[PDB]
Design a protein around this nucleic acid. Structure first.
Ligand code: MG
Ligand code: MG
Ligand code: MG
Ligand code: MG
Ligand code: MG
Ligand code: MG
Lengths: 121, 312, 70, 63, 206, 55
RNA sequence: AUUGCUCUUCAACGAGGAAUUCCUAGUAAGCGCAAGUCAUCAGCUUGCGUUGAUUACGUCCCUGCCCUUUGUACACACCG
RNA sequence: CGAUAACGAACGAGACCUUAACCUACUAAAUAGUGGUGCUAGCAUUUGCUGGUUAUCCACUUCUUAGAGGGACUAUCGGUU
């Protein structure tokens, strides 16, 4: 089995929180910039943290992965979220009601364009 | 004038990290790849199998990051991640001088116009300048993150003995260095991302630099002032100006967006067909090179093949 | 004896492919290499299977001597 | 004398008391679009071809 | 074919074998089409070998033995009953003599005799042990094509071994005759006799 | 370290184990094998205006 | 009869019942050598190479061990 | 991993250390080894073949050895959850 432990899976997600714009989808460049920017005592452990960090980035190209919260990522997700919908779904340019909605709005003291339909049991 | 895919070269097993050609032999092409070897190619013009390998250079223990060629094309220099440089003979292999003194990955190399001294940018945040015999004349500092690519500017004006270099690293700030007295001159501020590449035009007065942001950003080094910033809208790896036209090619992560700069339009948006690989990603070019005459555009991709593009 | 035979064949196959690498072009290298590597892969690559150390409690590396309960 | 050749399209899982027997779903080469569940004794992958000695039988599980 | 000479003289009959086809010690791997459509993809022919002793590593993954050549697997089952463990140069001599005997005794190709022999001695349906309580019960299940090839090689070689034991006949001439007897299919071959015996017990339990 | 104290009832064994701090080592490994520390990047503002300093 | 050598004498044993052990690739098995003990004595052990398979890439059926639920008048705890 | 009144860690597992496998990349070597050139032997005879030789000496590091390092992280692609 090749299931990674906490140390690999925990340091890598911490590393991505504060170094996401530097590092890439290539294990080699990844295994070089971690080697200066963090202290790992062994070469074998540096190779597994970088290898899982490369794996996590590819997951980040398609949607959000749980367990990371760095302020950048959600804000860019926040930015591309309007879609600027053509016309408001609530507005009918060309509204429908039951009888109880009709006497409700007559109780409120409002006059507004209404079409009454019976909604029966 | 429009680009069409003519053929492909297959000699490698790793990412073709750099291409280089020399004006003396338009049948030459030197390609450096991630399998720590270089291949020289005999450009035969054919419908299929356009260009054939003839010489392999082996001798670098870890990844060879780029290659440059001398003007006559007799000698080649290759910069590799094993903290060495190797000067090779294209005829007989049999490397003449091995340049050591960098303590980390060397990323880019460039020989002089007069083939006298040799600049080398590495990941140890230094730019070492070397003899043809192999001695590091200087160590050029002030550069916070590591250097990612260096090149020399082309002397086109008559009786300019002067040689100044350009450097780009991941500290988002590119520099100009006069190497006769070893000063720094220019600090082009303005990038917001890890700068992957930079290219001087054969005018010797323009420099385009481009990085992780997607801004292929343009500078006039004749006046030392910014010209404008183009937008490739994703991450970019290499740039090259055509030796004759007013043209610039750029290796985006989608494809090779190639730009005319005088009416400021991208011309083709060429994207080749791959017959597989569709789910994960299409493989993308990481290194492009024009010919001497500008007739052929070379591109090495990450699927370890080299695609060519022809003008009309 | 049979180990010496396999080391001989790998040495001459690699030696031929090394000769065409240095002197002859790279085209002759690849047709040479491909025909070798298609037929049998260990003509060029050494077999990585190494001896496994012996462990106390058995004659071999995996075998144990005999368990008896009564 | 009848035998039917049958191409395995989806291996289901291990059955039997010891675990040495696998449920597979086989498609007949001739008269396709007929599907059945059978027992296999040895190592099996998909796109293998069984020789069912008789086709009119279906096991589900071995208890 | 033109004979090339060089400073070390190389014998002419091995020199012919270089370009012409890369066939076996004496026999060709063409015209060696296996008949049954289940047992194909699990006998590995049409990639010819010169010698039946390949120091290959096939035991790592589950079905890599199906890429091992069928003449190699035949040799591998010969080095058994303990005293013969190891001794592969002993095995490939015997297989060479066995193939010579088959060719002399019937003119038809020896390895084609070997390939249809193992197709005959694959047991098609076989029984398994369900408990049932006290008295152990039988259930008839079907056999994998890989297991059928696996069983066939073992069934063939055990019969050669028990017949060439304590008997003037050498193991090579014994190994030929059951391989002939199975490939025609006779019920006088041990491998055929065992095969129908398993199927009758399976037929008893449906 | 291990000691045998000889009392009048019998021997009293005394074990002592001391874990020294890896940071104060000064000779060899300074940390445990699986200690990983990521250095905090110093955060700076985006420039949004291209300029050339000169000399 | 320490052990070694020569010659002679040349027994059981024709693959072993109920039972039962070890093992998933340079592994099992075959085959030797060195070292330890050692003045002498290896059919032993610790290692090392040499030659090198078949079968499987599963399961809880047997035997053990672990966990959950549950009952308890037990708690030196069912040998209660 | 996921569910989730739990979040975040510690010991043990893992990491670590030793060893075996790769390095025509570095540093080097009659206590390791080639190739030559001397001196010879035998056989041929063309321009070769195989040896012997310790004071012939000059260069070499592929193989041998161990220092420093590099390298694998299941990389890439496909499938299935
Ligand atoms: Mg006999
Ligand atoms: Mg039993
Ligand atoms: Mg033994
Ligand atoms: Mg009760
Ligand atoms: Mg009580
Ligand atoms: Mg699959």
């Amino acid at each position: 089995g090749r299931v990674r432990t906490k140390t690999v899976k925990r340091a890598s997600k911490a590393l991505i929180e504060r170094y996401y714009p530097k590092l890439t989808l290539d294990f080699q460049t990844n295994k070089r910039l971690c080697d200066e920017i963090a202290t790992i005592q062994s070469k074998r452990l540096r190779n597994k943290i970088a290898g899982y960090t490369t794996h996590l980035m590819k997951r980040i190209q398609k949607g959000p992965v749980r367990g990371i919260s760095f302020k950048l990522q959600e804000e860019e997700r926040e930015r591309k979220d309007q879609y600027v919908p053509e016309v408001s779904a609530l507005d009918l340019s060309r509204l429908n009601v039951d009888n109880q909605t009709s006497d409700l709005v007559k109780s409120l003291g409002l006059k507004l364009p209404l079409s009454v339909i019976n909604v029966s049991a | 004038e429009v680009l069409v895919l003519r053929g492909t070269l297959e000699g490698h097993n790793g990412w073709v990290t750099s291409l280089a050609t020399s004006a003396g032999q338009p049948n030459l092409l030197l390609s450096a790849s991630r399998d720590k070897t270089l291949i020289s190619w005999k450009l035969t013009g054919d419908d299929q199998k356009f260009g054939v390998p003839v010489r392999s250079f082996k001798g670098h223990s870890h990844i060879v990051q780029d290659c440059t060629l001398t003007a006559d094309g007799a000698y080649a220099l290759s910069a590799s991640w094993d903290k060495t440089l190797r000067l090779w003979d294209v005829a007989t292999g049999e490397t003449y001088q091995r340049f050591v003194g960098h303590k980390s990955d060397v990323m880019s190399v460039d020989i002089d116009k007069k083939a006298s001294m040799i600049i080398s940018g590495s990941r140890d945040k230094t730019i070492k300048v070397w003899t043809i015999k192999g001695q590091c004349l200087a160590t050029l500092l002030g550069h916070n993150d590591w250097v990612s690519q260096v090149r020399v500017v082309p002397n086109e004006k008559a009786d300019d003995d002067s040689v100044t270099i350009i450097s780009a690293g991941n500290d988002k700030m590119v520099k100009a260095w006069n190497l006769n007295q070893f000063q720094i001159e220019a600090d082009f501020i303005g990038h917001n991302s890890n700068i992957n590449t930079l290219t001087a035009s054969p005018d010797g007065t323009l420099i385009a630099s481009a990085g992780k942001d997607g801004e292929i950003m343009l500078w006039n080094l004749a006046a030392k002032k910014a010209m404008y910033t183009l937008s490739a809208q994703d991450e970019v790896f290499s740039l090259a100006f055509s030796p004759n036209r007013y043209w610039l090619a750029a290796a985006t992560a989608t494809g090779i967006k190639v730009f005319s700069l005088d009416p400021q339009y991208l011309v083709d948006d060429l994207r080749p067909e791959f017959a597989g690989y569709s789910k994960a990603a299409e493989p993308h070019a990481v290194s492009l090179a024009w010919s001497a005459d500008g007739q052929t555009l070379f591109a090495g991709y990450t699927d370890n093949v080299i695609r060519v593009w022809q003008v009309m | 004896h049979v180990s010496q035979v396999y080391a001989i064949r790998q040495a001459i196959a690699k030696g031929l492919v090394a000769y065409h690498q240095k002197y002859v072009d790279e085209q002759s290298k690849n047709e040479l290499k491909k025909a070798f590597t298609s037929y049998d892969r260990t003509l060029l690559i050494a077999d990585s299977r190494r001896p496994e150390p012996k462990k106390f409690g058995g004659k071999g590396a995996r075998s144990r001597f005999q368990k008896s309960y009564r | 004398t009848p035998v039917t050749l049958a191409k395995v399209i989806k291996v289901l899982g291990r059955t039997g008391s010891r675990g040495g027997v696998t449920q597979v779903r086989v498609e007949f080469l001739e008269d396709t679009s007929r599907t059945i569940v059978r027992n296999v004794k040895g190592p099996v992958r998909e796109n293998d071809i069984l020789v069912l000695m008789e086709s009119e039988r279906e096991a589900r599980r071995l208890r | 074919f033109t004979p090339v000479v060089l400073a070390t003289p190389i014998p002419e009959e091995v020199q012919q074998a270089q370009t012409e086809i890369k066939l076996f010690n004496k026999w060709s791997f063409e015209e060696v089409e296996v008949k049954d459509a289940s047992l194909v993809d699990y006998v590995q022919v049409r990639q010819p070998i010169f010698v039946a002793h390949t120091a290959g590593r096939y035991a790592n993954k589950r079905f890599r033995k199906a890429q091992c050549p069928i003449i190699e697997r035949l040799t591998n089952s010969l080095m058994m009953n303990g005293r013969n463990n190891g001794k592969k140069l002993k095995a490939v001599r015997i297989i060479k003599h066995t193939l010579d005997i088959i060719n002399v005794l019937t003119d038809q190709n020896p390895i084609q005799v070997v390939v249809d022999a193992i197709t005959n001695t694959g047991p098609r349906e076989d029984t398994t042990r369900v408990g049932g309580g006290g008295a152990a019960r039988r259930q008839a299940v079907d056999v994998s094509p890989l297991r059928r090839v696996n069983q066939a090689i073992a069934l063939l070689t055990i019969g050669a071994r028990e017949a060439a034991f304590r008997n003037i006949k050498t193991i090579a001439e014994t190994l030929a005759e059951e391989l002939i007897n199975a490939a025609k299919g006779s019920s006088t071959s041990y491998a055929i006799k065992k095969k129908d015996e398993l199927e009758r017990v399976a037929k008893s339990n449906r | 370290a291990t000691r045998h104290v000889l009392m009048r009832q019998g021997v009293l064994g005394i074990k002592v184990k001391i874990m020294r701090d890896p940071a104060k080592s000064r000779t060899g490994p300074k940390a445990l094998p699986d200690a990983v520390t990521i250095i905090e990047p110093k955060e700076e503002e985006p420039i949004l205006a291209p300029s050339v300093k000169d000399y």
